[model samples]
Target: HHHHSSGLVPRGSSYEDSQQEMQLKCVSQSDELDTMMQNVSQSVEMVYSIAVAKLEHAASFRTSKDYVDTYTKQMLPILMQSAQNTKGALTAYIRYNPEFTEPTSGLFLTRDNSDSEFESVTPTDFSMYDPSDVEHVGWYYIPVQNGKETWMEPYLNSNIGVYMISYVIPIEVDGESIGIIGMDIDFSEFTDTIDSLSIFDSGYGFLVNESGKVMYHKDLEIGSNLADADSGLQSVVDALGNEQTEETAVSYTYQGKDKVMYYKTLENGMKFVLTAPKTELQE
Candidate 1:
């Protein structure tokens, strides 16, 4: 004979189970950001590969205009389609190395608000900018120098009056870097996700870059150094510096209220952080 009884579990054991479940929820929420970034990366790679294939069959063009015209006609549609398919992507561009094409020549297309087409814009001229000036030309020089794909830190785009982050890949041909293909996304694209993260009525989320700079925070300005945020957050920066792999929760007081913080390092080296009042967790 077998007897089975089902009723309420012990409060102590149920509490422990709930705590573990909360941690899983936090992890899964951060994973959403990772998935979004991966999608954008794949979209950019697709456009780059197609551009490289077209270049392989082309012989030579006489003028920079000819190069631009040839690529714009062939690549614009594909670029537009890729941008439309990838959410939050603002623009896609192909900038030929100055040696291969004129410094001012390339194809740049910004997604139209209507979502059905792209608007071509004159490519930024890097001729007058020094390669060493990472502030201005880092988007191009960083990938070209590293000879690999790179995700650039967020920076203000003076030309368009918006803050943006870029993913760039060097276009190499016959063992030489000939150009770059890249995509840009507005900074809000990242923060919007962080802003939507919920942990309770008072819980909120923020992001920190690989270098310990605050990328997004409701109370902090972008680019603020994490180490300087506060003593509590400073310890978080220190813990990150040591590269700890174990999950740990930090307890601290902020603005006269007790709080607890948890963070997970994303695959791209950014940190997704969640914080809520300590009292809320007890309930």
Candidate 2:
């Protein structure tokens, strides 16, 4: 039965899937973000400074409502302009304090390159909670307290189940961190890009973080530990921890048949793994 199954695997598979498998590795890793990180931080600084300038000009001339509206108007154009220029910047926003004292409202602008306009995203209302009420203040509030920019790990956004990481920078006034400005890098499209490459007929791919948590998988949740599954996954985890090798392929037994798994550690410390039956690799 084992021999028969292995023989049958190659019949339905393609060599082209094997060839294209190399191209599918690490479609979007952290190394690419090294360039975008500084750009995002500078964008935050520019927008933060611009907001401060607008507030200064409106100190006596505008009501609190007018102050928010005027700053938002001035900020959107610059944000839209930046988003138009940056390759991966999907949206930009400033989360500001309710009375200019603490962050309670988010003013957002998303670029519409096809239409050549800035589309406004409805602001999230966060005013009801006291800082004492939550385990963590929130992503929007953390940067302000940290006083540094950061790239967060992947998370599923609630509305559409989109996974993303935000590049967040604290907005400071008079040496006090008052709010934050951030840009979103949506992972759904990138995940689609990775998924488009089907490496083999019986093969499927998955991604894992440095801590052995699966970041992407056709059959597994993002946070599941592949190590808990079997030796095949364990070997892939081993390959991920090895610094000398960039890529590795290993033979093992899975589901009562001989199999092979190809895995690589990404520059971002995540792992990409693809697996197929042994016959799938036969030329």
Candidate 3:
């Protein structure tokens, strides 16, 4: 609905003055600026939502065969095929790879040139339950590395180099286990999209984990801990702690510059953070 102001003119007022007077009105709560910001934040949410849904939808596709036959015949292949089609990476180190002898091993790195493709998925990768987590498979927001079966990380995959960040979703079968579905999209792509957004040098976007550590960069170890984290951790801590978990607009400082920030949480237990200069959002 459009808001209008009452028109009044003094006898001596010129036609131009009268027109200007008529156009002048008070702009309140729903400022044009706020409307645009709300829209931008909504758009960000919609895009990320679609991406996550698609990734997980494909992730849930699995069968209930015996563990060995299920993984050997179905699980791993589905993950590999999905990765190739999605143009992303997939790993299920512990459950799928034999080297992950321990129940749910962590630690991301592994040896090169081996029959098994995945390596080192150590404990840091969230299998929070005790060591027996393997018996009951649930969603694990593993760090970049786990034991030998599945993991994510920062190294340059000669196949698709360029500082990438990754996500792994595990798929199990037959009350036993199958494999993992993974995502290793080019971080530059996500960052470039944020860069072209409304925020002037004012905005910054990042990814963080439940422990309040930044995981947006290529290397997980860099922002491995909550305290020694990169600049993005503070915002992440706030996002995870808040009850709203909705898009929040506030002034933020990133890369040493102060700007407006918009943070949204993901079902994957992560935060999609956007920091932009408020001034840029106005335009």
Candidate 4:
């Protein structure tokens, strides 16, 4: 029997079969991202819990210099190694609320990729969490709580020279925020997952945030706005049709070739997009 020129298996073969078969692979790939997010959250949660417990003892030290060094020495490569195995985090450290903190500075431990060791970093005003740093507070809006932690949007890591997101939990001594425990999680693996897929010779996969901003793309730089038609990624935004929840594909033509985009909503509100030109689908 001759297949339709479009190359989809003959229509009416099985509605459930067609829908399930096409979406199943996309769903599976999207789920991999979800699993990775879960692992990263779990790993950060564990360290956050441990830090809260240790801070009780840490609070006793009278001087900031003493406490910071002691805390650093205790965590060192030990805590760093454990979290890295679980989540691929590249850094771990505690930061005091400068207003409440005596010394107005804190210690940070960042992983050294070459030696597989954690080293001390000169503490600056680590504005990654400070609300006053208007430009830097994009992802720190979550209220601080004892057991609960929040994640930050991806940003460039000054120490490691790579892009990363941080998971941070607030530390409280009384009813006030005194500090936070944080980890810089490596998301290179997430990008690797998108890159390693066999979507098609000209097809590719990418990720976008809730705001429809591109988070990952092969041809575009990270954080580039995808809504712009000039970058050639507007196809994704156009396919999304400005709606937040749609699992179905949107058909469009790119560079004169018929293409389709498959998108799924991640558990955390982010969107995963996979695209393919028509020729590859014409089996």
* Model 1 misplaced regions, further than 4 Å: 1-18, 57-73, 112-116, 128-136, 241-258
Whole-model lDDT per candidate: 0.73, 0.59, 0.39, 0.63
Best of the two (1, 4) by TM-score: 1
Clashes of each: 0, 1, 24, 0
Which consecutive 10 residues in model 4 have the weakest lDDT in total? 134-143
Give one digit per residue, the lDDT tens place, for model 4 in 164-263. Answer: 7667767766666666666665667678888876454556778888666777888767776776635465666765656643667666666677776778
Task: Give lDDT tens digits, candidate 1, residues 112-212.
Answer: 44255667888878887877766566678888988888887778766666788888889887668778888777777678888776764567888887566
Note each model's CA RMSD in angstroms.
6.1, 8.2, 14.3, 7.1
Which has the better TM-score: candidate 1, or candidate 3? 1
**Which one is best on TM-score?**
1
Give me the runs in candidate 4 sitting further than 4 Å from their true place.
1-22, 34-36, 53-81, 102-107, 120-122, 125-148, 172-175, 230-246, 267-269
Q: What is the lDDT of candidate 2?
A: 0.59
* Ranked by lDDT, top first: 1, 4, 2, 3
lDDT of 3 by residue, 1-283 (tens): 8989635534422433422222221112113213323332333233334333333322232322233343334333443333333322222222332223233332233222224454433423333343334222222324213522232333344322345444554443333333343344344544454444332332345555556666664335545654454565466466567757545444555445555544554433455555444444443
Q: lDDT of candidate 4 vs native?
A: 0.63
- Model 4, residue 116: displacement in angstroms? 1.5
State which candidate has the highest lDDT. Answer: 1
Q: Better model by lDDT, 2 or 4?
A: 4
**TM-score of every model?**
0.79, 0.61, 0.41, 0.68
